[PDB]
Amino acid sequence: DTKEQRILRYVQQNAKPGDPQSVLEAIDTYCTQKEWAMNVGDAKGQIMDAVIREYSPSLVLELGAYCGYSAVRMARLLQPGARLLTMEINPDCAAITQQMLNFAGLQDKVTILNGASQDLIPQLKKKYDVDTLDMVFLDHWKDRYLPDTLLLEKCGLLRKGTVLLADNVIVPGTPDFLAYVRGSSSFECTHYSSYLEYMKVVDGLEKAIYQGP
Numbered sequence: 001d002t003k004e005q006r007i008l009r010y011v012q013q014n015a016k017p018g019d020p021q022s023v024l025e026a027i028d029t030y031c032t033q034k035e036w037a038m039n040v041g042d043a044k045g046q047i048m049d050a051v052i053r054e055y056s057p058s059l060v061l062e063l064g065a066y067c068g069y070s071a072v073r074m075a076r077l078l079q080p081g082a083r084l085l086t087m088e089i090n091p092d093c094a095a096i097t098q099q100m101l102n103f104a105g106l107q108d109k110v111t112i113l114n115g116a117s118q119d120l121i122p123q124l125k126k127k128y129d130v131d132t133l134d135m136v137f138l139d140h141w142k143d144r145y146l147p148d149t150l151l152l153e154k155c156g157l158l159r160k161g162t163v164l165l166a167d168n169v170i171v172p173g174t175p176d177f178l179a180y181v182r183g184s185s186s187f188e189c190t191h192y193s194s195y196l197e198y199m200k201v202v203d204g205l206e207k208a209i210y211q212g213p
């Protein structure tokens, strides 16, 4: 088996079914004690929780699911009837993510979109019935952060106040995205310094609130 399968099995065997917090704790325990993995982790996760609670978004798009950690983290804090769409290019990871969400009891709040962001973003309006997004969590290929932000805008998916929250802006890093949003009058930006998941290595999140054309 794969690392990702091992993580899922550990959750199934050490967390309580239907209890998202127990699922997060199990993942973070496994990844601290047994095998590192690229989940957002608890340090940056606490910042995400604070942001989610501030905005109470109705419709969230996540770019990059992996094993479902961040999807569980966000979905557990959504209000009744609020929804998360999460895009995952790797089909084996899509399947882990769906199983993770199922175990957590969050499957009614979350939809997986299978494919690449550059192919799926232009389908959101017509196939997934999206008007505009309230929040976007970027956690996919670093070279796609900037082009997908620009694509979201082109497709009319951003509104005044849409919150972009980006993982890994320091490590591995997203220099073009950071330079762009920080230099643009169309975004209001804030950097949240933190640590790489499971590691004593500095990383951070960037929040960039869209302000219109």
Ligand SMILES: O=c1c2cc(-c3ccc(F)cc3)cc(O)c2ncn1CCCCCn1ccc2cnccc21
Pocket: 038, 039, 040, 063, 064, 065, 066, 087, 088, 089, 090, 115, 116, 117, 118, 139, 140, 141, 142, 144, 167, 168, 171, 172, 196, 197
């Ligand atoms: O690579 C990383 C990563 C690496 C490290 C990391 C740090 C330090 C290290 F030393 C090593 C790795 C730490 C992290 O937190 C990471 N988070 C996310 N990702 C992106 C994973 C692959 C996304 C593929 N993908 C998923 C949906 C989707 C849609 N369209 C296109 C592509 C798409």
Ligand SMILES: [Cl-]
Pocket: 038, 039, 040, 041, 065, 066, 067, 068, 069, 070, 071
């Ligand atoms: Cl994650």
Ligand SMILES: [Cl-]
Pocket: 040, 041, 042, 043, 044, 196, 197, 198, 199
């Ligand atoms: Cl952590």
Ligand SMILES: [Mg+2]
Pocket: 038, 039, 040, 139, 167, 168
């Ligand atoms: Mg990440």
